[PDB]
Amino acid sequence: SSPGIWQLDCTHLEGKVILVAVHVASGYIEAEVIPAETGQETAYFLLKLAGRWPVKTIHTDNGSNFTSATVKAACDWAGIKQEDGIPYNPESMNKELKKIIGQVRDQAEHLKTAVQMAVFIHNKKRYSAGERIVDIIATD
Amino acid sequence: SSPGIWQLDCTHLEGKVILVAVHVASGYIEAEVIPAETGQETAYFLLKLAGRWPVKTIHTDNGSNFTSATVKAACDWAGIKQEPQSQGVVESMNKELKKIIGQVRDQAEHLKTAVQMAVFIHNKKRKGGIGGYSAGERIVDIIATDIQT
Numbered sequence: 001s002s003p004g005i006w007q008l009d010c011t012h013l014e015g016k017v018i019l020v021a022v023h024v025a026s027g028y029i030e031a032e033v034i035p036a037e038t039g040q041e042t043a044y045f046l047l048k049l050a051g052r053w054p055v056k057t058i059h060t061d062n063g064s065n066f067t068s069a070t071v072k073a074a075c076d077w078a079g080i081k082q083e084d085g086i087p088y089n090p091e092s093m094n095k096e097l098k099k100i101i102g103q104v105r106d107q108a109e110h111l112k113t114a115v116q117m118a119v120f121i122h123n124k125k126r127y128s129a130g131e132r133i134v135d136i137i138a139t140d
Numbered sequence: 141s142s143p144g145i146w147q148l149d150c151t152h153l154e155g156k157v158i159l160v161a162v163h164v165a166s167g168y169i170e171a172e173v174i175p176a177e178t179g180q181e182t183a184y185f186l187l188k189l190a191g192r193w194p195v196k197t198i199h200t201d202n203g204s205n206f207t208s209a210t211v212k213a214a215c216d217w218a219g220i221k222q223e224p225q226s227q228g229v230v231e232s233m234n235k236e237l238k239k240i241i242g243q244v245r246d247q248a249e250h251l252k253t254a255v256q257m258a259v260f261i262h263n264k265k266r267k268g269g270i271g272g273y274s275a276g277e278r279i280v281d282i283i284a285t286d287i288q289t
């Protein structure tokens with residue numbers, strides 16, 4: 001799997017929306033609770049992702065938040081190729097994420113915090129996805 | 141010099157608060173406009189950072205937001221040690237970030253957007269000529285080496 005390809009999807013919990021980004025080649029994940037599943041929030045999420053990791057292509061679930069012209073603008077600016085409707089086949093990752101969230105939920109006063117704790121655990125769990133993504137992306 | 145050392149601080153622009161984190165060894169930056177400089181926002185910022193990179197130690201100013209019970213709980217949970225030499229780098233980035241923001245501010249309505257655009261531009265920018273690297277390449281390279289050593 002190309003090192004610049006990310007799978008973009010969503011998942012819901014406690015009446016809240018979580019945007020999920022998975023680095024297909026490593027299984028590394030980035031996720032965050034967002035106010036609403038809108039194009040503006042999705043574009044912002046993508047701009048942050050692209051500025052922290054090499055994002056060359058995103059495969060989305062083709063939800064209306066992704067078909068949004070606002071997201072298209074963000075992708076064009078960041079040089080991201082958007083491919084909608086491409087199923088994840090390296091979400092079952094959403095299940096894993098939800099499972100970990102449950103293991104740390106009572107340690108956080110807010111879901112948003114628990115989600116980040118779950119991402120941390122997932123990425124550092126043993127080679128870990130975190131170690132894998134850096135080894136794959138490293139240029140020198 | 142260690143790959144797990146980060147310097148954090150804040151900067152103000154347009155009456156808003158920006159939390160900035162710099163990976164000392166690489167110059168790689170993470171920043172974001174936050175509602176207010178509170179302990180809650182700082183802890184959240186830190187947890188997101190720690191889940192992405194191997195944050196071992198953070199050098200911050202002495203503001204109340206960095207020493208709140210929730211920030212300590214977050215650092216405790218993530219295994220992060222809290223500690224002008226330990227702020228000179230991030231302070232330099234505050235200016236560098238502000239400089240880039242001013243160059244693309246017209247390309248976005250909200251400051252929060254321009255901030256992320258600036259972060260992108262800074263981290264992807266190749267330093268030097270042919271043979272040079274970007275800050276984003278440096279942090280990845282540094283960590284990859286540490287993991288395989």
Ligand SMILES: Cc1nc2ccccc2c(-c2ccc(Cl)cc2)c1[C@H](OC(C)(C)C)C(=O)O
Pocket residue numbers: 039040041043044047069070073074077078247248249250251253254
């Ligand atoms: C409000 C907004 N509206 C838009 C409507 C149509 C197309 C693009 C945008 C962008 C836009 C502009 C530049 C890029 Cl690179 C990406 C999106 C923003 C953007 O806010 C976000 C980022 C919070 C949605 C901003 O602050 O300007």
